[model samples]
Each structure stands twice: as structure tokens, then as C-alpha cells.
Target: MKKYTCTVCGYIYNPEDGDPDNGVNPGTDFKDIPDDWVCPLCGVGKDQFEEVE
Candidate 1:
């Protein structure tokens, strides 16, 4: 599983800790996140996030 971080607010999103505020469950891959999903902390779209090494 890969992790991603928000470029705008530095919110690190992990597949094992899905964004429940938006109804995303754990174990979800960053690539599989819904199109409408955004950063829970900054509200930035997926376009604002990049894969973390």
C-alpha cells in the first residue's frame, strides 16, 4: 500500500487510515479514492496530492 501527502497543507493520507469524514474506509488505495474525495484537513482535491516515498 502506498501513501500520499497533500501538497497544499501537508496532510499525509494513508491507505490504512482512510478519510472517514468523507466516507472512505480503511484499506483503500490512494489511487482508488473517489473522484470527489478531498483532503480532510485542507479540502484540496486529489490533484493536489502526490505519492509519498
Candidate 2:
């Protein structure tokens, strides 16, 4: 599972631990997140996210 970071808030999103608080089920991939899905912390859209090591 890939991990992505919200550029605006520095919040890390891991596919293995999907954001239940935000309605993302566990095992959800970043690529599968809806276009309307914003960062739970900063409200930034997917375009503002970046992959991380």
C-alpha cells in the first residue's frame, strides 16, 4: 500500500489504515479515493497530495 502526504497540512495518508473518520475504508488505495475526497485535516484535494517513502 502506498502512502501519501497532504502538502497543505503535512498529514500522512496510508492505504493500510484508511481514514475511517473520513469514510475511507481500510485497504483503500490513494488512487481509488474519490476526486471529491479532501484531506481530513486541511480540506485540500487529491491534487495537493504527494507520495512519500
Candidate 3:
């Protein structure tokens, strides 16, 4: 699993563990995540995250 480092806050994003605090689920690759997905820590996951359910 590749971990993408957030440019804004440097939050490590691992495909094996998609941001759990925000939304995205685990086992999701950077591209696997919705095309509109964003980092939850960077500007609050950019602008593609929804309230955690």
C-alpha cells in the first residue's frame, strides 16, 4: 500500500487505511478512492469528503 503524503499538513495517507476519521474506507488506493476524494486533514480533505457516518 502506498502512502501519499499530504502537501498541506503532511498527513500520511495509506491506501491500506484510507482516512478513517473523515470518511474514505480502508483497502482503498489513492486512485481507488472516489475520483473526487481529498485528504481529510488538508483543508478538511480538500473538498470531497462527507460527514463520517
Candidate 4:
């Protein structure tokens, strides 16, 4: 599994086997961010996502 961090809000997204309606969702591949999806916290583009350790 991969971890994602929101650059604007510093929110960590983890795999929880559930739905994350805030643009990002469970089972969502880092490479498959929908073009129309916007960050719920800061309204940033997919470019704002950074891989976290």
C-alpha cells in the first residue's frame, strides 16, 4: 500500500478499505487521480499529492 500526504493540509491518506468521498478514495491508485477531482481540504490539483513514508 502507498501513503499519500496532502501538501496544503498535511493530511495523511491511508488505505482503509472504505470510501473517501473527498476526491481521494480507497483503492485509488496514486497514478489514477481523476482530472475532475479536487482536493477537499485545499482544492489543490493532483500535483499537490506527495508520497509519504
Candidate 5:
């Protein structure tokens, strides 16, 4: 799975270490992330995220 960065606050979302606090499991793909999932750091929506290396 690829990582994504939040455009609003530069929060990097790693699929290998999913947002457990928000109920996202490890290895969860960015596209598979729930729509209600928000950036744990900046509280931004998934639409604000961009694919990254």
C-alpha cells in the first residue's frame, strides 16, 4: 500500500500503520479508507490527501 500526505497540514498516512485510534487496521489501502476517516493530526478529509512515495 502507498502512503498519503495531507495537503492541509502535511500529515502522512501510512498504510502499514493504519490509524488504529480511528478504527483503521494495518495494511489498509488509502482508497479503502472510510470516508468518515479524517486526518488524526489536522482533522482534514481524505480528499485533501495526495499519494506519496
Candidate 6:
């Protein structure tokens, strides 16, 4: 599974599934982020997210 780390809050979103509350539900791909799904932690745009190993 892929992992995503937040740059602003250092929050780790590491799951077999993505964050459901953010509409990044399980099995969702990184490319699936909508144009308007703001980061719940820092309200930053989706561009602030980084793919983690």
C-alpha cells in the first residue's frame, strides 16, 4: 500500500486505506484527490502531500 505524509503537520496517513473523512477513502489512489479536497490538518491544497516510503 502507498503512504502519504503531511508536510505542514507531520501527520502520517499510512494505511491500506486512505483517510475516509477527507474523501480519500480506502483503496483510493493518490491521483484520485479531487481538485478541491483540502487537507484536513492544515487546510493546504493537495499539492502539500508527499508520497512516503
Q: How does each model score on TM-score?
A: 0.92, 0.90, 0.60, 0.63, 0.94, 0.70
Q: In the order shown, what is each candidate's alpha-carbon RMSD?
A: 0.7, 0.9, 7.7, 2.5, 0.8, 1.8
The digit string of per-residue lDDT tens for model 2 on 1-53 reads 88999999999999999988878989999999878999999898999999997
Q: Cα RMSD for candidate 4? A: 2.5
Q: Name the lDDT of candidate 5.
A: 0.94
lDDT order, best first, reads 5, 2, 1, 6, 4, 3
Give Cα-based local distance difference scores for all models: 0.91, 0.92, 0.61, 0.66, 0.94, 0.73
Estimate the lDDT of model 3: 0.61
Candidate 3's residue-wise lDDT over 1-53, tens digit each? Answer: 56676666766677677766657788876656665656666654533422222
Per-residue lDDT tens digits for candidate 6, residues 1-53, read 66777788876665566779877777776667676876677887767878887
Question: Candidate 2: misplaced stretches above 4 Å?
Answer: none
The reply for model 1, stretches above 4 Å from the true place, is none
Backbone clash pairs for candidate 3 read 39-45, 40-45
Error of 6 at 52 (Å): 0.5
Evaluated at residue 30, the lDDT of candidate 3 is: 67
Q: Give stretches of model 3 more than 4 Å off.
A: 44-53
lDDT of 5 by residue, 1-53 (tens): 89999999999999999998899999999999999899999897999999997
By TM-score, the candidates rank as 5, 1, 2, 6, 4, 3
Clash pairs (backbone) in predicted model 2: none
Q: C-alpha displacement of 10 in model 4, angstroms?
A: 0.9
- Model 4 TM-score is 0.63
What's the C-alpha lDDT at position 53 in model 3?
A: 20
Best by TM-score: 5
Error of 5 at 26 (Å): 0.6
